[PDB]
Each structure stands twice: as C-alpha cells, then as structure tokens.
C-alpha cells in the first residue's frame, strides 16, 4: 500500500509514535517519505547481503528474519515479510525497539541526512489528527 502523507501521519499517531522517545510525528513521516516513499512494499538490497524492508526500511542484519542473511539477528522476532503488510503495526512495533537502541533515529540514514535539523513539522501540516 502506498500511504498518503496525512493518512500515514494519522496511522503512526494512533500507534503511539508521536513523541515516542522524544521524536515528534513529523520526524517519523519524514523518515518514511525518504526511506520508502510511503510504500509498505519497498525492499532494497544492501552490499553486505542484508535487505531493508517496508515503510521504514528495517534491516535484516539485525531486526527481522528473511532466511537469507547469514549470521544475522532477529531482534524484533518477526519475518521480514511481515514488515511489508498494508497494516503498519509490525513496522511500528519494531521501529520502537530500534529507536530505543541508543542511537535514536540516527539508525535511519535518510532521517540523518534529510530530516534531522529540518522543519519536520511541515510533514504533518494541514493534516486532521
């Protein structure tokens, strides 16, 4: 499913992401935009053999099992395919674990390079929530 900007902001807010660990909603919407362009089915292969999955491009090296990432961890205890569902619950629950890892949202390269330090509130402007 390809989410609309405000549609995703509302979905994330309902799942408890607004201000989770100090990160306002605009941060999560911005990260999703540049990581997957709001597409829950986005997948991208990395050079190390791992693969990123879903709306927030969660990596198979440490967070989910996709059966083809040798010596990887499944910290979120879920098949990576689950992160491609139209229902973002799995992605949200796993992202919460990731952001608590210690490096905050810096775990998401697109967020660090394209959202961090910008006016992220702009990503939820006009939205009804």
Nearer to Na ion, 73 or 125 (CB): 73
Q: Which does 104 bind (CB under 5 to 8 A by kind): Cl ion, Na ion, none?
A: Cl ion
Q: Which does 74 bind (CB under 5 to 8 A by kind): Na ion, Cl ion, none?
A: Na ion
- Closest by CA to 122, choosing from 22, 29, 7, is 29
Instruction: By CB under 5 A, name the one of 39, 74, 85, 93 that touches Na ion.
Output: 74
Tell me: does residue 65 bind Na ion (CB under 5 A).
yes
Beta-carbon contacts of residue 116 (< 8 Å; ≥ 6 apart): 105, 106
Breaks in the chain (C to N over 2.5 Å), named by the residue before each, are: none
Question: Of 7, 18, 48, 52, which is the active-site residue?
Answer: 52
Instruction: By CB under 5 A, name the one of 104, 112, 116, 127 that touches Cl ion.
Output: 104
Q: Is 101 annotated as a binding residue?
A: yes
Instruction: By CB under 5 A, name the one of 72, 84, 107, 108 that touches Na ion.
Output: 72
Q: Are 127 and 9 in contact (CB under 8 A)?
A: yes
Instruction: Based on the residue annotation, tell me whether 52 is a catalytic residue of this protein.
Output: yes
Distances from the Cα of 53 to the Cα of 19, 90, 98, 99, angstroms: 23, 11, 14, 16
């Amino acid at each position: 499913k390809v989410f609309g900007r405000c549609e995703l902001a509302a979905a994330m807010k309902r799942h408890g992401l607004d201000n989770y660990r100090g990160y306002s909603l605009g941060n999560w919407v911005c990260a999703a935009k540049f990581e997957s362009n709001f597409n829950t089915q986005a997948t991208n292969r990395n050079t190390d053999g791992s693969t990123d999955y879903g709306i927030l491009q969660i990596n198979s090296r440490w967070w989910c099992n996709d059966g083809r990432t040798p010596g990887s961890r499944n910290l979120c205890n879920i098949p990576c395919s689950a992160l491609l569902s139209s229902d973002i619950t799995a992605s949200v629950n796993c992202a919460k674990k990731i952001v608590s890892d210690g490096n905050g949202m810096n775990a998401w390269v697109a967020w660090r390079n394209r959202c961090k330090g910008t006016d992220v509130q702009a990503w939820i402007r006009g939205c009804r929530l």
